[PDB]
Amino acid sequence: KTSLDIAEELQNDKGVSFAFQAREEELGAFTKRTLFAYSGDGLTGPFKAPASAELSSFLTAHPKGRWLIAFPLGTGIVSVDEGILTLEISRSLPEVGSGSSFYLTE
Amino acid sequence: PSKTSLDIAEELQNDKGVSFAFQAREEELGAFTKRTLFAYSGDGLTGPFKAPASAELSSFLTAHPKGRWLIAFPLGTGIVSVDEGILTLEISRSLPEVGSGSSFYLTE
Amino acid sequence: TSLDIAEELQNDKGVSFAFQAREEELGAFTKRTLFAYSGDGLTGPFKAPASAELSSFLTAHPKGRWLIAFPLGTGIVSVDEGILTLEISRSLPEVGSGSSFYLTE
């Protein structure tokens, strides 16, 4: 059922930190991959931080090559490039809070 | 042991090639049961999405206390309903990309 | 494996919410998620007595409250002396469902 369930804390160069969880679930013919993201901090601009090789692999796997994600106060896109995660945001966020983004594939 | 008593998924496509994956899950939490609809599309939606659903998905969708599913996507809001095995998703605004979202209810 | 608290709260005006509070372990990480559902509308804040167990769970958030997105607006859930308060960003003709979590190690 659940074949991957990993979590890690990432921090950018100015001390903003995020917890990310990557979950993979098998549902008969379908596989579901969910990215969960949490930060108590605000973001003025994009969040860029080194990510584990395993989280990077998971992020790369998305059919869109990136992860559109809703937070309470705005929208983000999560991507990875050479082990650096980037979360770009639609507007500055005084607090990020929590959100998730998934896809299903068969 | 698992709390998940139902976990089904299916892919729907409309006459215009837009496609959605839907997952229906039921989780038993003692006195309460949660039923969740998960929806995903990489496509945009100009207007409502209509496609045939399985008998199982249709039954799950019908069971909601409101008779339909208010659902948040990143760029707008939808209502998912079913009528004679045709699923309809109506959207609040046109969406350049739908992305993912979920809608649940809890019942005792 | 996950641990859940679930209950239905009602205010003095008949608005009802269901809450599920889930705790999950992911190695060095703990994830706590609050799930909230109401089919009702809300003009202003929802206030109702909550169980000691839900109150305890709610208090554990590092921010001391739960920023939560519903389809039509944002809320903050807090607890004070076993009374749950959900404050909302704008009036909601229908609350719907939403969830709020944190993960910490």
Author numbering:
A (entry chain C): 239 to 344
B (entry chain A): 237 to 344
C (entry chain B): 240 to 344
Quote from the publication.
Trimeric fibre proteins protrude from each of the twelve vertices. These fibre proteins have an amino-terminal virus-binding sequence, a central shaft domain, and a globular, carboxy-terminal fibre head domain involved in initial receptor-binding. The SnAdV-1 fibre head is the first Atadenovirus protein structure to be solved at atomic resolution. Despite the low sequence identity with other fibre heads, the topology of the beta-sandwich is identical to that of known adenovirus fibre head structures and contains ABCJ and GHID beta-sheets (the E- and F-strands in the long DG-loop of human adenoviruses 5 and 2 are absent). However, it is significantly more compact, making the 107-amino acid long SnAdV-1 fibre head the smallest adenoviral fibre head structure known.
Four monomers were present in the asymmetric unit, three (chains A, B and C) forming the biological trimer and the other (chain D) forming a trimer with two crystallographically equivalent monomers in the crystal (space group I213 has a three-fold crystallographic symmetry axis). Amino acids from the N-terminal T7 and 6xHis tags could not be modelled in the structure due to lack of density, as was also the case for residues 234–236 of each of the chains and residue Lys345 of chains A, B and C. Using NCS-restraints, the structures of both the seleno-methionine variant and native protein could be refined to low R-values at 1.6 and 1.7 Å resolution, respectively, with good geometry and Ramachandran statistics. When the structures of the fibre head monomer of the different crystal forms are superimposed, no significant differences in main chain conformations were observed. When trimers are superimposed, the r.m.s.d. is less than 0.5 Å, suggesting the orientation of the monomers in the trimer is also fixed.
